[PDB]
Coordinates of C-alpha atoms and ligand atoms in Angstrom, one line a residue:
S1 CA 73.0 -15.6 37.1
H2 CA 73.0 -16.0 33.3
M3 CA 75.7 -18.5 32.3
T4 CA 78.0 -18.7 29.2
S5 CA 77.7 -22.0 27.3
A6 CA 81.2 -23.1 28.2
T7 CA 80.5 -23.0 31.9
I8 CA 77.2 -24.8 31.6
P9 CA 77.6 -28.3 33.1
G10 CA 77.8 -31.0 30.5
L11 CA 79.3 -28.8 27.8
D12 CA 82.8 -29.3 29.1
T13 CA 82.4 -33.1 28.5
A14 CA 80.5 -32.8 25.2
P15 CA 81.5 -34.8 22.2
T16 CA 83.9 -32.6 20.2
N17 CA 84.1 -34.9 17.1
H18 CA 81.4 -33.0 15.3
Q19 CA 82.0 -29.2 15.6
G20 CA 78.9 -28.1 13.8
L21 CA 76.7 -30.1 16.2
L22 CA 78.7 -28.8 19.2
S23 CA 78.5 -25.1 18.1
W24 CA 74.8 -25.4 17.6
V25 CA 74.2 -27.0 21.1
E26 CA 76.3 -24.2 22.7
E27 CA 74.3 -21.5 20.8
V28 CA 71.0 -23.0 21.9
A29 CA 72.1 -23.6 25.6
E30 CA 73.3 -20.0 25.7
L31 CA 69.8 -18.9 24.7
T32 CA 67.6 -21.3 26.7
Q33 CA 69.8 -21.4 29.8
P34 CA 69.4 -25.0 31.0
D35 CA 70.9 -26.1 34.3
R36 CA 72.9 -28.7 32.5
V37 CA 73.3 -30.4 29.1
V38 CA 73.2 -34.1 28.5
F39 CA 74.0 -35.9 25.2
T40 CA 72.0 -39.1 25.0
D41 CA 73.4 -42.5 23.9
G42 CA 70.3 -44.6 23.7
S43 CA 71.7 -47.3 25.9
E44 CA 69.7 -49.5 28.2
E45 CA 71.4 -48.1 31.3
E46 CA 70.4 -44.6 30.2
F47 CA 66.9 -45.7 29.5
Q48 CA 66.3 -47.1 33.0
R49 CA 68.0 -44.1 34.6
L50 CA 65.7 -41.6 32.8
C51 CA 62.7 -43.8 33.6
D52 CA 63.7 -43.7 37.3
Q53 CA 63.7 -39.9 37.2
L54 CA 60.4 -39.9 35.3
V55 CA 58.8 -42.1 38.1
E56 CA 60.3 -39.8 40.7
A57 CA 58.8 -36.7 39.0
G58 CA 55.4 -38.4 38.8
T59 CA 55.5 -38.1 35.0
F60 CA 55.5 -42.0 35.0
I61 CA 54.2 -44.7 37.2
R62 CA 55.6 -48.2 36.7
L63 CA 53.0 -50.6 35.4
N64 CA 52.8 -54.1 36.8
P65 CA 55.8 -55.8 35.2
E66 CA 54.2 -59.2 35.4
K67 CA 51.6 -57.9 32.8
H68 CA 53.9 -55.5 30.9
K69 CA 57.6 -55.7 31.5
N70 CA 59.5 -52.4 31.6
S71 CA 56.4 -50.3 31.0
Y72 CA 55.0 -47.0 32.2
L73 CA 51.9 -44.9 32.3
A74 CA 52.0 -41.1 31.8
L75 CA 49.0 -38.8 32.4
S76 CA 49.2 -35.4 30.6
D77 CA 47.9 -31.9 31.3
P78 CA 44.3 -31.8 30.0
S79 CA 45.3 -28.9 27.8
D80 CA 48.0 -31.0 26.1
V81 CA 46.3 -34.1 24.7
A82 CA 46.8 -34.0 20.9
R83 CA 48.7 -32.5 17.9
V84 CA 47.5 -28.9 17.4
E85 CA 47.1 -28.3 13.7
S86 CA 46.2 -24.5 14.0
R87 CA 49.6 -24.0 15.7
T88 CA 51.6 -26.0 13.1
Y89 CA 53.4 -23.8 10.5
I90 CA 55.4 -24.2 7.3
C91 CA 57.7 -21.2 7.2
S92 CA 59.0 -21.2 3.6
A93 CA 60.5 -18.0 2.3
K94 CA 57.4 -17.5 0.2
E95 CA 53.8 -18.2 1.1
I96 CA 53.0 -19.9 -2.2
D97 CA 55.6 -22.6 -1.2
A98 CA 53.5 -23.4 1.8
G99 CA 50.3 -23.3 -0.2
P100 CA 46.6 -23.6 0.6
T101 CA 46.8 -26.9 2.7
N102 CA 49.4 -25.3 5.1
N103 CA 49.6 -22.5 7.7
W104 CA 52.2 -20.0 6.6
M105 CA 54.0 -17.2 8.4
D106 CA 57.0 -15.1 7.2
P107 CA 60.1 -17.0 8.5
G108 CA 61.7 -13.7 9.8
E109 CA 58.6 -12.9 11.7
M110 CA 58.3 -16.5 13.1
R111 CA 62.0 -16.6 14.2
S112 CA 61.6 -13.3 16.0
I113 CA 58.6 -14.6 17.9
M114 CA 60.1 -18.0 18.8
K115 CA 63.6 -16.9 19.6
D116 CA 62.0 -14.6 22.2
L117 CA 60.0 -17.5 23.6
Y118 CA 63.1 -19.7 23.8
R119 CA 65.1 -17.1 25.8
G120 CA 65.5 -18.5 29.3
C121 CA 62.9 -21.2 28.6
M122 CA 64.9 -24.1 30.0
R123 CA 65.9 -22.6 33.4
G124 CA 65.7 -25.2 36.1
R125 CA 65.8 -28.1 33.5
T126 CA 68.2 -30.5 31.9
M127 CA 68.7 -29.8 28.2
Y128 CA 69.0 -33.1 26.4
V129 CA 70.8 -33.4 23.0
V130 CA 69.2 -36.4 21.3
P131 CA 70.9 -37.8 18.2
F132 CA 68.8 -40.1 16.0
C133 CA 68.6 -41.8 12.6
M134 CA 65.4 -42.1 10.5
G135 CA 65.4 -45.5 8.8
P136 CA 68.0 -48.3 9.2
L137 CA 71.5 -47.1 9.9
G138 CA 73.1 -48.9 7.0
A139 CA 71.4 -46.7 4.4
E140 CA 73.2 -45.0 1.5
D141 CA 72.0 -41.5 2.6
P142 CA 71.0 -42.0 6.2
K143 CA 68.7 -39.2 7.3
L144 CA 70.0 -38.0 10.6
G145 CA 68.6 -35.6 13.1
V146 CA 69.3 -34.2 16.6
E147 CA 66.5 -33.2 18.8
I148 CA 67.3 -30.8 21.6
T149 CA 64.6 -31.0 24.2
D150 CA 64.0 -30.2 27.9
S151 CA 61.5 -33.1 28.2
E152 CA 62.7 -36.3 29.7
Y153 CA 59.5 -37.9 28.5
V154 CA 60.4 -36.9 25.0
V155 CA 63.8 -38.5 25.3
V156 CA 62.5 -41.9 26.4
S157 CA 59.8 -42.0 23.7
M158 CA 62.3 -40.9 21.0
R159 CA 64.4 -43.9 22.0
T160 CA 61.5 -46.1 21.1
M161 CA 60.3 -44.2 18.0
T162 CA 63.7 -43.7 16.3
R163 CA 67.2 -45.3 16.2
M164 CA 68.5 -43.0 19.0
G165 CA 71.9 -42.3 20.4
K166 CA 75.4 -43.5 19.9
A167 CA 75.1 -45.1 16.5
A168 CA 73.4 -42.1 14.9
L169 CA 75.9 -39.7 16.5
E170 CA 78.8 -41.7 15.0
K171 CA 77.1 -41.7 11.7
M172 CA 77.2 -37.9 11.7
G173 CA 81.0 -38.1 11.5
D174 CA 82.9 -34.7 11.8
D175 CA 80.7 -32.6 9.5
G176 CA 77.8 -34.7 8.4
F177 CA 74.5 -33.0 7.6
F178 CA 71.6 -33.5 10.1
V179 CA 68.2 -32.0 10.7
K180 CA 68.3 -29.5 13.6
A181 CA 65.2 -30.1 15.7
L182 CA 64.6 -27.9 18.7
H183 CA 62.0 -28.4 21.4
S184 CA 60.9 -27.0 24.8
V185 CA 57.9 -27.6 26.9
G186 CA 58.0 -23.8 27.7
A187 CA 57.8 -24.2 31.5
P188 CA 61.0 -22.8 33.1
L189 CA 61.6 -23.4 36.8
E190 CA 63.0 -21.3 39.6
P191 CA 65.7 -22.9 41.8
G192 CA 64.0 -25.2 44.3
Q193 CA 60.6 -24.9 42.6
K194 CA 58.5 -28.1 42.6
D195 CA 57.7 -29.2 39.0
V196 CA 54.5 -30.8 37.8
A197 CA 54.2 -34.3 36.2
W198 CA 53.5 -32.9 32.8
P199 CA 54.8 -29.4 32.1
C200 CA 53.6 -27.5 29.1
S201 CA 52.5 -24.0 28.0
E202 CA 49.3 -22.3 26.8
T203 CA 51.4 -20.9 24.0
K204 CA 52.3 -23.4 21.3
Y205 CA 54.2 -23.4 18.0
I206 CA 55.2 -26.4 15.9
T207 CA 57.3 -24.7 13.1
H208 CA 59.1 -26.0 10.1
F209 CA 61.8 -24.2 8.0
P210 CA 61.9 -26.3 4.8
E211 CA 64.9 -24.7 3.2
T212 CA 67.2 -25.3 6.1
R213 CA 65.5 -28.6 7.2
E214 CA 64.9 -27.2 10.7
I215 CA 62.1 -27.8 13.2
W216 CA 61.2 -25.6 16.1
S217 CA 58.6 -26.7 18.6
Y218 CA 57.4 -24.9 21.8
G219 CA 54.9 -25.5 24.5
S220 CA 53.6 -29.0 24.0
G221 CA 55.0 -32.3 25.3
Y222 CA 52.6 -34.4 23.3
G223 CA 53.1 -36.9 20.5
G224 CA 53.5 -35.3 17.1
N225 CA 54.1 -31.9 18.6
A226 CA 57.1 -33.0 20.6
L227 CA 58.4 -36.3 19.2
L228 CA 60.0 -34.6 16.3
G229 CA 61.0 -37.6 14.3
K230 CA 57.4 -38.7 13.8
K231 CA 55.4 -36.2 11.7
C232 CA 57.6 -33.2 11.7
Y233 CA 60.6 -34.9 10.3
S234 CA 59.4 -38.1 8.6
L235 CA 56.5 -36.3 6.7
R236 CA 56.8 -32.6 6.6
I237 CA 60.6 -32.0 6.3
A238 CA 61.1 -35.3 4.5
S239 CA 58.5 -34.4 1.9
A240 CA 60.5 -31.3 1.1
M241 CA 63.7 -33.3 0.9
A242 CA 62.0 -35.9 -1.3
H243 CA 60.7 -33.1 -3.5
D244 CA 64.3 -31.8 -4.1
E245 CA 66.0 -35.2 -4.2
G246 CA 63.6 -37.2 -6.5
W247 CA 61.9 -39.6 -4.0
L248 CA 58.7 -39.8 -1.9
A249 CA 58.0 -39.3 1.8
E250 CA 54.5 -40.6 2.4
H251 CA 51.8 -41.3 5.0
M252 CA 51.6 -45.0 4.2
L253 CA 51.5 -48.3 6.0
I254 CA 53.8 -51.0 4.4
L255 CA 52.2 -54.4 4.0
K256 CA 53.8 -57.7 2.9
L257 CA 51.4 -60.2 1.4
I258 CA 52.4 -63.8 0.7
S259 CA 50.4 -65.9 -1.8
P260 CA 49.9 -69.7 -1.8
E261 CA 52.8 -69.9 -4.3
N262 CA 54.9 -68.5 -1.5
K263 CA 55.7 -65.3 -3.4
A264 CA 55.9 -62.0 -1.5
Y265 CA 54.2 -58.8 -2.6
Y266 CA 54.6 -55.4 -1.0
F267 CA 52.0 -52.7 -0.8
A268 CA 52.1 -49.1 0.5
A269 CA 48.7 -47.9 1.5
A270 CA 47.5 -44.3 2.5
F271 CA 44.4 -43.7 4.6
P272 CA 43.2 -40.8 6.7
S273 CA 42.1 -41.4 10.3
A274 CA 39.0 -43.5 11.1
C275 CA 39.5 -45.9 8.3
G276 CA 41.0 -48.9 10.2
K277 CA 44.5 -48.2 8.9
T278 CA 46.2 -50.2 11.7
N279 CA 43.9 -53.2 11.4
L280 CA 44.9 -53.4 7.7
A281 CA 48.6 -53.0 8.5
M282 CA 48.4 -56.1 10.7
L283 CA 45.8 -58.0 8.6
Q284 CA 45.2 -61.7 9.2
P285 CA 44.1 -63.2 5.9
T286 CA 41.0 -65.4 6.0
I287 CA 41.7 -67.4 2.9
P288 CA 43.9 -70.5 2.9
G289 CA 47.5 -70.2 1.8
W290 CA 47.6 -66.4 2.2
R291 CA 49.8 -64.8 4.9
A292 CA 50.5 -61.2 5.9
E293 CA 53.4 -59.4 7.6
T294 CA 53.9 -55.7 8.4
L295 CA 56.8 -53.4 7.8
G296 CA 55.0 -50.3 9.3
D297 CA 51.6 -48.8 10.0
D298 CA 52.3 -45.1 9.5
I299 CA 55.1 -43.6 7.3
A300 CA 56.8 -44.9 4.2
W301 CA 59.8 -43.6 2.3
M302 CA 60.0 -44.7 -1.3
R303 CA 63.0 -44.3 -3.6
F304 CA 63.8 -45.8 -7.0
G305 CA 66.2 -48.7 -6.9
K306 CA 68.8 -49.5 -9.6
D307 CA 66.4 -51.9 -11.2
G308 CA 63.9 -49.0 -11.7
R309 CA 61.3 -50.2 -9.2
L310 CA 60.1 -48.2 -6.2
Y311 CA 61.5 -49.4 -2.8
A312 CA 60.0 -48.6 0.5
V313 CA 61.5 -48.2 4.0
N314 CA 59.9 -47.4 7.3
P315 CA 61.9 -44.4 8.7
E316 CA 60.5 -45.1 12.2
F317 CA 61.6 -47.6 14.9
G318 CA 58.5 -47.8 17.1
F319 CA 54.7 -47.7 17.0
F320 CA 52.8 -44.6 18.4
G321 CA 49.2 -45.8 18.0
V322 CA 45.8 -44.6 19.2
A323 CA 44.8 -47.0 22.1
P324 CA 41.0 -46.7 22.2
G325 CA 39.4 -49.2 19.7
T326 CA 42.4 -51.5 19.8
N327 CA 41.3 -54.9 21.2
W328 CA 41.8 -58.7 21.0
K329 CA 38.9 -59.5 18.7
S330 CA 39.8 -56.9 16.0
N331 CA 43.6 -56.6 16.4
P332 CA 45.2 -59.4 18.3
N333 CA 48.5 -58.7 16.7
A334 CA 48.6 -55.2 18.1
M335 CA 47.6 -56.5 21.5
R336 CA 50.4 -59.1 21.3
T337 CA 52.9 -56.4 20.3
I338 CA 51.9 -54.3 23.3
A339 CA 51.8 -57.4 25.6
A340 CA 55.6 -57.8 25.2
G341 CA 56.1 -54.6 27.3
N342 CA 58.8 -51.9 26.9
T343 CA 55.8 -49.7 26.4
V344 CA 55.0 -46.1 27.4
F345 CA 51.2 -45.5 27.5
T346 CA 49.8 -42.0 27.7
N347 CA 46.4 -41.1 29.0
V348 CA 44.9 -44.6 29.2
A349 CA 43.1 -46.0 32.3
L350 CA 44.7 -48.0 35.1
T351 CA 43.2 -51.2 36.4
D352 CA 43.3 -52.3 40.0
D353 CA 46.0 -54.8 39.3
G354 CA 48.4 -52.4 37.6
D355 CA 47.3 -53.2 34.0
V356 CA 45.9 -50.8 31.4
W357 CA 42.5 -50.4 29.8
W358 CA 40.8 -48.1 27.2
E359 CA 37.4 -48.0 25.6
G360 CA 36.9 -50.9 23.2
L361 CA 39.2 -53.3 25.1
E362 CA 37.8 -56.5 26.4
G363 CA 37.4 -57.2 30.1
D364 CA 34.5 -55.1 31.4
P365 CA 36.6 -53.9 34.3
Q366 CA 34.3 -52.9 37.3
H367 CA 36.6 -50.1 38.6
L368 CA 39.3 -48.0 36.9
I369 CA 41.4 -44.9 37.6
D370 CA 40.7 -42.7 34.5
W371 CA 43.2 -40.6 32.5
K372 CA 42.6 -37.7 34.9
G373 CA 43.4 -39.8 38.0
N374 CA 39.8 -40.1 39.0
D375 CA 37.7 -43.2 40.0
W376 CA 35.7 -44.7 37.1
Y377 CA 32.9 -47.3 37.4
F378 CA 31.5 -49.8 34.8
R379 CA 28.1 -49.0 33.3
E380 CA 27.9 -45.9 35.5
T381 CA 30.5 -43.2 35.0
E382 CA 29.6 -41.1 32.0
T383 CA 33.1 -39.9 31.0
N384 CA 35.6 -42.0 29.0
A385 CA 38.1 -43.9 31.1
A386 CA 40.9 -43.4 28.6
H387 CA 41.3 -40.1 26.7
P388 CA 40.0 -40.7 23.2
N389 CA 43.4 -39.8 21.7
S390 CA 45.4 -41.8 24.2
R391 CA 48.5 -43.7 23.0
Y392 CA 50.8 -46.7 23.3
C393 CA 54.5 -46.2 22.4
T394 CA 56.1 -49.6 21.7
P395 CA 59.1 -51.1 19.9
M396 CA 58.4 -52.4 16.4
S397 CA 60.7 -55.3 16.9
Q398 CA 58.1 -56.8 19.3
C399 CA 55.5 -57.2 16.7
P400 CA 54.9 -61.0 16.2
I401 CA 54.1 -60.5 12.5
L402 CA 56.9 -58.1 11.7
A403 CA 58.5 -58.9 8.4
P404 CA 62.1 -59.9 8.5
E405 CA 62.9 -57.3 5.8
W406 CA 61.8 -54.5 8.2
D407 CA 65.4 -53.3 9.0
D408 CA 66.8 -53.8 5.5
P409 CA 68.4 -50.4 4.4
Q410 CA 67.5 -51.2 0.8
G411 CA 63.8 -51.4 1.5
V412 CA 61.3 -53.6 -0.3
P413 CA 60.0 -53.3 -3.9
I414 CA 56.4 -51.9 -4.0
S415 CA 54.0 -53.7 -6.4
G416 CA 51.0 -51.6 -5.5
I417 CA 50.1 -48.3 -3.9
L418 CA 46.6 -48.1 -2.3
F419 CA 44.6 -45.1 -1.4
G420 CA 41.5 -45.3 0.7
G421 CA 38.8 -43.5 2.6
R422 CA 35.3 -44.0 4.2
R423 CA 32.4 -43.4 1.8
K424 CA 28.8 -44.4 2.5
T425 CA 28.1 -44.1 -1.2
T426 CA 29.5 -43.7 -4.7
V427 CA 33.0 -45.2 -4.4
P428 CA 33.4 -48.9 -5.0
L429 CA 35.0 -51.5 -2.7
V430 CA 38.1 -51.5 -5.0
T431 CA 39.1 -49.8 -8.2
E432 CA 42.4 -50.0 -10.3
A433 CA 43.8 -46.9 -12.0
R434 CA 44.1 -46.9 -15.8
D435 CA 47.8 -45.8 -15.5
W436 CA 50.2 -43.8 -13.4
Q437 CA 48.8 -40.4 -14.1
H438 CA 45.3 -41.5 -13.5
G439 CA 46.7 -43.0 -10.3
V440 CA 48.0 -39.6 -9.2
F441 CA 44.6 -38.1 -9.8
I442 CA 43.0 -40.9 -7.7
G443 CA 45.3 -40.1 -4.8
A444 CA 45.1 -36.4 -5.3
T445 CA 41.3 -36.4 -5.0
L446 CA 41.0 -38.9 -2.1
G447 CA 37.7 -38.2 -0.4
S448 CA 36.7 -39.4 3.0
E449 CA 33.6 -38.8 5.2
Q450 CA 33.2 -35.8 7.4
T451 CA 30.3 -34.1 9.2
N452 CA 29.7 -34.6 3.2
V453 CA 33.2 -35.4 1.9
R454 CA 36.6 -34.2 3.0
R455 CA 39.5 -34.2 0.5
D456 CA 42.7 -35.6 1.9
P457 CA 45.2 -36.0 -1.0
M458 CA 47.4 -39.1 -0.5
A459 CA 46.3 -38.8 3.2
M460 CA 48.9 -36.0 3.5
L461 CA 46.5 -33.0 4.1
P462 CA 48.0 -31.9 7.4
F463 CA 51.5 -33.2 6.7
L464 CA 52.8 -31.6 3.5
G465 CA 56.0 -29.7 3.7
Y466 CA 55.3 -27.7 0.5
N467 CA 52.7 -26.5 -1.9
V468 CA 50.1 -29.3 -2.6
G469 CA 50.0 -28.5 -6.3
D470 CA 53.8 -28.9 -6.6
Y471 CA 53.5 -32.1 -4.6
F472 CA 51.1 -33.4 -7.3
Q473 CA 53.5 -32.4 -10.0
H474 CA 56.3 -34.2 -8.1
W475 CA 54.3 -37.5 -8.3
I476 CA 53.6 -36.9 -12.0
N477 CA 57.3 -36.2 -12.6
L478 CA 58.6 -39.4 -11.0
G479 CA 56.1 -41.5 -12.9
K480 CA 56.8 -39.7 -16.2
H481 CA 60.5 -40.4 -15.9
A482 CA 60.3 -44.0 -14.8
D483 CA 60.1 -47.4 -16.5
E484 CA 56.3 -47.6 -16.7
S485 CA 56.5 -51.4 -16.5
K486 CA 58.2 -51.2 -13.1
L487 CA 55.9 -48.6 -11.4
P488 CA 53.5 -49.7 -8.7
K489 CA 49.9 -50.1 -9.9
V490 CA 47.6 -47.7 -8.1
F491 CA 44.3 -48.8 -6.5
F492 CA 41.6 -47.1 -4.4
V493 CA 39.8 -49.0 -1.7
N494 CA 36.6 -48.3 0.2
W495 CA 35.9 -50.9 2.9
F496 CA 32.9 -48.9 4.2
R497 CA 30.2 -48.5 1.6
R498 CA 26.7 -48.7 3.1
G499 CA 23.3 -49.8 1.9
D500 CA 20.3 -47.4 2.0
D501 CA 19.2 -49.1 5.2
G502 CA 22.6 -48.5 6.8
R503 CA 24.0 -52.0 6.5
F504 CA 27.7 -52.5 5.8
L505 CA 27.9 -53.9 2.2
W506 CA 31.3 -55.4 3.0
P507 CA 32.1 -57.2 6.2
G508 CA 35.7 -56.0 6.1
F509 CA 38.5 -56.6 8.6
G510 CA 40.3 -59.8 7.8
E511 CA 38.0 -60.3 4.8
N512 CA 39.8 -57.4 3.2
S513 CA 42.4 -60.0 2.2
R514 CA 40.0 -61.1 -0.5
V515 CA 40.3 -57.7 -2.1
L516 CA 44.0 -57.9 -1.7
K517 CA 44.0 -61.2 -3.5
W518 CA 42.3 -59.6 -6.5
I519 CA 44.9 -56.8 -6.4
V520 CA 47.8 -59.4 -6.4
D521 CA 46.1 -61.2 -9.3
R522 CA 45.8 -58.0 -11.3
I523 CA 49.5 -57.3 -10.7
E524 CA 50.2 -60.8 -12.1
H525 CA 47.6 -60.3 -14.9
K526 CA 45.7 -63.2 -13.6
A527 CA 42.4 -61.4 -13.0
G528 CA 39.7 -59.5 -15.0
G529 CA 37.3 -56.7 -14.0
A530 CA 35.0 -54.2 -15.7
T531 CA 36.3 -51.1 -17.5
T532 CA 34.2 -48.3 -15.9
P533 CA 34.5 -44.6 -16.1
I534 CA 36.5 -44.4 -12.9
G535 CA 38.9 -47.3 -13.6
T536 CA 38.9 -51.1 -13.5
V537 CA 36.4 -52.5 -11.0
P538 CA 35.9 -56.2 -10.4
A539 CA 32.4 -57.8 -10.5
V540 CA 31.4 -60.2 -7.8
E541 CA 32.6 -63.1 -9.9
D542 CA 36.1 -61.7 -10.1
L543 CA 36.4 -61.9 -6.3
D544 CA 37.2 -65.0 -4.2
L545 CA 34.2 -65.1 -1.9
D546 CA 34.6 -68.8 -1.1
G547 CA 34.0 -69.5 2.6
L548 CA 32.5 -66.1 3.1
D549 CA 28.9 -65.9 4.3
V550 CA 27.8 -62.8 2.6
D551 CA 24.9 -61.8 0.4
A552 CA 26.3 -61.6 -3.2
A553 CA 23.9 -58.7 -3.9
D554 CA 25.6 -56.7 -1.1
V555 CA 29.0 -57.3 -2.7
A556 CA 27.6 -56.4 -6.1
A557 CA 26.3 -53.2 -4.6
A558 CA 29.7 -52.5 -2.9
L559 CA 31.2 -52.7 -6.4
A560 CA 28.6 -50.8 -8.4
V561 CA 29.7 -47.7 -10.4
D562 CA 26.6 -45.5 -10.9
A563 CA 27.1 -42.8 -13.5
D564 CA 24.5 -40.5 -11.9
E565 CA 26.3 -40.8 -8.5
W566 CA 29.6 -40.0 -10.2
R567 CA 28.2 -37.0 -12.1
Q568 CA 27.2 -35.7 -8.6
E569 CA 30.8 -36.3 -7.5
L570 CA 32.3 -34.1 -10.2
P571 CA 31.6 -30.6 -8.9
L572 CA 32.9 -31.7 -5.5
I573 CA 36.1 -32.7 -7.2
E574 CA 36.1 -29.5 -9.2
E575 CA 35.9 -27.2 -6.2
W576 CA 38.7 -29.1 -4.6
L577 CA 40.9 -28.7 -7.7
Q578 CA 40.1 -25.0 -7.6
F579 CA 41.1 -24.8 -3.9
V580 CA 44.5 -26.4 -4.9
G581 CA 45.1 -23.1 -6.6
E582 CA 47.5 -21.7 -9.2
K583 CA 50.0 -24.6 -8.8
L584 CA 47.4 -27.3 -9.8
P585 CA 49.2 -29.4 -12.4
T586 CA 47.6 -29.5 -15.9
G587 CA 48.1 -33.3 -15.7
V588 CA 45.7 -33.4 -12.8
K589 CA 43.1 -31.2 -14.5
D590 CA 43.6 -33.5 -17.6
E591 CA 42.5 -36.5 -15.5
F592 CA 39.4 -34.6 -14.3
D593 CA 38.4 -33.8 -17.9
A594 CA 39.0 -37.4 -19.0
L595 CA 36.8 -38.7 -16.2
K596 CA 34.1 -36.2 -17.0
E597 CA 34.2 -37.3 -20.6
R598 CA 34.1 -41.0 -19.8
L599 CA 31.1 -40.4 -17.6
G600 CA 29.1 -38.5 -20.3
Ligands
OXL701 O1 48.5 -39.9 15.2 C1 48.7 -40.1 14.0 O2 49.6 -41.0 13.5 C2 47.8 -39.3 13.0 O3 47.0 -38.5 13.4 O4 47.9 -39.6 11.7
MN702 MN1 49.5 -41.2 11.0

C-alpha cells in the first residue's frame, strides 16, 4: 500500500521550476504518505474551494454573511486551545545556544523522535504545500517560506496571515532560499474512516532548528503551534536570522502618530500579554490635532536603512487576535476591522442570528451556543461562552485606521522604541532612557505582574530563537555601531500603576495619547522632565492634561520615583541577571551597577 512519491497524485503535476522545493516535497510525502499533494496558489477560487470542504467537514460553519461577509466559525478539540510552551523547543547544536529562556533538546535526538512520528502520519489526508512571503513581496531580501501541512484549516488561515501562494512561489525562482516549515495534526485516517471537525494529537512538538532555519510541528492544529509564519518564523527563526544578519526581529506593535503640525512619527512598542497591547496599536487620541494609524499589533522587523535610521516592517498580513475583551467601547477600530468580514473565528460563541459573541462584547445576548456547542444562558450559565483564548483571524487591509505605508517594502523610520508592563507600584507612567545602552537594560529587565514580578525581556521571553544573553549583546552591538543621533529613543511605559486603595492612578486607554505627546516632544527636544535614578520622568506639569478630568495628585503619584521602592527592586533585577547566566553581557551588568549607584 505504501506509495513512492512519484506515483502520489499531485506530484506528477507539481511545479518543477524550483528543484530544491520539489525534492523536499517528494521526500516529505514519501515519509508521511498523504493520499495526494496540493501546491496552493492563494487565489480567491482556491480559498472558497477550501472553505467549502471545511464546511463539509464540519470544521467550519458559515456565519451569517449579512453580518460578516465570507466568514466562518471553527470549534476546536478542547485539548487543543492554545500555544503549548512546554512542548516548544529550540534545537540548536549546543544547549547554551538555546539558553535559559528556552527548552532545549539535542537535535539528533529530536529528529529521531519526530521523524518516527511523521512516518505515515498523513495517511487519508491531502498534503498541502503552502508557499508564503513574510513582509511585502517587493523587499530587498524577501523572507520566504513553505509550510507543508495536512490541515486545510491551517492553509486558509495562512492565506490571511501571510502573503500566500503564487507570488511567493515565483519569488523563490529556481534555487532561492526559503524556510522549510513542516506540520501535521498527527491524526492519520484509514480509507473510508469518518474524520472529526478538529483533528489533533495528545502528542505535541513545536520544534525549531535555528542553524538550518527549519520548523517542525506535530500534533496541534491551533494558532501559533500550527500557523508557522506567526510566532515560529517571524519571531523564533527570524530572531536567529536577525542575530546573524545584523537586524532585529521583535515582538512589537507598530504605531504611526501624527501631530498637529501634520508630521508623522513611528513607534515600535513591546508588551507582554494582559497589558492592553492591541488597544494601544489602534489608539484613538483624545487631544485635538493628534491622529493615530497602525502598521501592526504584534511583530516588527527592524533593519538599518541607508540613512542610518532603523526602519520597521510588519512581516505579517493578517491579525490573529484574542477575541474576549475586544468590544465597541474600548476598541471600536478592531470591531470595525472584524465587521468587514473575511474572518475565521475560532472558539467564540454563536448568536441565534448567526453572529458571534465573546465575553466583554456588548449586547447582553440572552441565549448563545458556546465554544463547545452547548446552550448558554445570560446571567445563569456559569461557564464562559467563548473560550478565554478564542481568536479572530482577519485581513489587515480591512483595518479602517491602517497606515498607507503598511505594505511599503522599505518600512518606516522608527523614532522611538517603547517597553511596557503592568506594575501596581514602583514603575512610573513613563520614563525615558539616558541613552541606547541604558535603553537595552530597560528592555532587558522588563517586569510585569504575575501571581510578584515576572521578567519578560523585550516581551520576547517565550519567543527567542537563541540565548537570551547573546540577544542582549546583539541589541548592544547594533546601537554601538550605529549613528547615535539616528537611533530610536527608548522609553518604558506603565499604564497600570495603582494607589494604595486600589484606584487606577492613570485612566489610560485613549488618554495614553497624552503620554505619547510627551514622547514626541522629547524626540523633538520640545519637552522637559526630571532626571531621576531610573531615567528621565516627566512631572505633572510636563504633561498635557488639558481636557482630562483627573486628580493631579493621582498623576503625580503615577509619575513618582521613590528611592526606597527602587532599592527594593534591585535584588529582583539581580536575581534575573543571574538567571540570564554566563552569557549576560557586561554592558547589561554595567547598567545595573550604574542604577544601583545613582540610587545610593
Ligand atoms: O497570541 C499571541 O499573539 C501571544 O500570545 O503573544
Ligand atoms: Mn503576540
